[PDB]
Amino acid sequence: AMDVKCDMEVSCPDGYTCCRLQSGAWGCCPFTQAVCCEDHIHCCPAGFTCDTQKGTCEQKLAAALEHHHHHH
């Protein structure tokens, strides 16, 4: 249960993912897939998309932005 850790206040071992949130702490996602992104199971409290092509959930954007110019 202490195999993996994101900080000195969380405990997310194997099968878990470390995702930062606004709750002034980290989050443990017990799954294996697009962390803090896409549908299914997001480590984000919904309403947030993954940015930085890493998986940062922060409001609707485009999910995994690889381009520069865009018109929506």
Domain regions of the chain by residue span: 1-61
The CATH classification number of 1-61 equals 2.10.25.160
Q: HEC string of the chain? A: CCCCCCCCCCCCCCCCCEEECCCCCEEECCCCCCCCCCCCCCCCCCCCCEECCCCEECCCCCCCCCCCCCCC
**28 φ, ψ (degrees, to nearest 5):** -105, 115
Q: State the Rg of the chain over Cα.
A: 13
Residue 57 C-alpha from the chain's centroid: 6
Give the technique used to solve this structure. NMR
Residue type, 69: H
Phi, psi angle pair for 16, to nearest 5°:
-105, 155
